[PDB]
Amino acid sequence: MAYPMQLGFQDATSPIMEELLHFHDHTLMIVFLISSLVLYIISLMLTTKLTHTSTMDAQEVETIWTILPAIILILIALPSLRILYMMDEINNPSLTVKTMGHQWYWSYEYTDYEDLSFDSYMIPTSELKPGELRLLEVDNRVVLPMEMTIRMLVSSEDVLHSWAVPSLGLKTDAIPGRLNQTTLMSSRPGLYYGQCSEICGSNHSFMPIVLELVPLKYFEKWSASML
C-alpha cells in the first residue's frame, strides 16, 4: 500500500511487479539523461554574445539526431516487450477466482469445487476500528493462498470498473459481458490494497479491494467457513 510522502511505486509483492520496478528504473535513467541534455543545450545556446545569424547547412547533424533516438528507443522497447510477454505467459494455475464489479462494490466467486460467493464493501470511515485505513478497508477481504498461481477473471455486472492492486502489478478492466483474465501470484503473506480504476459513477472513489494472503491450509478452512 502507499505510505505518506511516497515518491515511487509501492514495494513489489510479486515477481512481475519487481520486474517492472527495475524496468522503470531503466527508463527513468534515460529520461533523466535526455531531459538534462536538453536543458544543458538550451542554457548553452542562451549564454553567448557570439552570433552567427547567417544560414547553416541543415542535413549534416540531422542524422545524429535521428539515429541516436532510434537506438535509445530500441533500448527501452526490448525490455518492455520481454516483460509484456511474461505477463501473459502460459501459466498453469492452481485456483481460479472471479470478481465482478458492481455499482459500488466488488463480489468474489470461488467456484472450482464449491459455490462460494460474497460481496466486498468498503468500511465507512465512521465504522473504522482504530488503526484501520480510511478509504481502503473492505469488510470481507478476498482470501487467497500465498505462493500460488491464482487465475483471476474480471468482469462486471453493470458499468465498467477496473480491478487493480498496485503492489502486485495488476489492473484489468471489468467489462460487462466480457471475462478478462489476469494472473496473480504473491510471494509474501499479508494484506494488499487496491481501488476501482475506471470511473463508474458517484462512488467510484469508494470501492477498494483488499487481498489477504495466507498459507494454503488456512485458505481451505476459510473457504469452508464462508460456506
Binding site: 498453469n92 492452481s94 485456483l95 481460479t96 487465475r151 466480457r178 471475462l179 483474465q181
Partner: peptide
Amino acid sequence: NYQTAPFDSRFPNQNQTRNCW
C-alpha cells in the same frame, strides 16, 4: 483430481469469454 480449468490453447489470450461459453 481437478484443481481448476487448465490452460486451453484454443483460448490463449486475456479474453476468456469464449472459454466459458
